[PDB]
């Protein structure tokens, strides 16, 4: 909903991966932005729009 930001997790297939890194991408980041690691932390800006 408006303002609420739910955290998503990404569990890689292998239990471990050396030198691993994630750079989350989303077309038109003006709606939301995410990056870092398996922890996403998706932020919501609007009340509609998939």
């Amino acid at each position: 909903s408006r303002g609420s930001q739910y955290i998503l997790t990404a569990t890689l297939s292998p239990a471990n991966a050396p030198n691993q890194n994630i750079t989350w991408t989303s077309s038109n980041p003006n709606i939301a932005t995410v990056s870092g690691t398996s922890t996403q932390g998706t932020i919501n800006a609007l009340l509609a729009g998939f």
Partner: protein, 94 residues
Amino acid sequence: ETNAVVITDLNPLYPRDRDYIYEGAAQIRLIKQTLQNTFPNVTEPVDIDSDTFKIMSEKLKFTGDAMDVGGLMIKNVTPGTGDKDVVTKGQMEA
């Protein structure tokens, strides 16, 4: 969860008693920011006024004419209105 920042913006029943619990922090933060922005000047002591505590919640009206004329005492200091004694003395002296 609403995206407003002011009072009378979200139905108290909006949680539905069924929404997820992870929204409680966002509700408390919203409430706190609303209380802060609706009274940003409250920093001195509590300064309780309660609107005269008796009747002024309804009698304090100002639409086309004011009421509740002040009952101040004499204004010997800061000469304002034409106190009766002063004007009488001035008139009798000329």
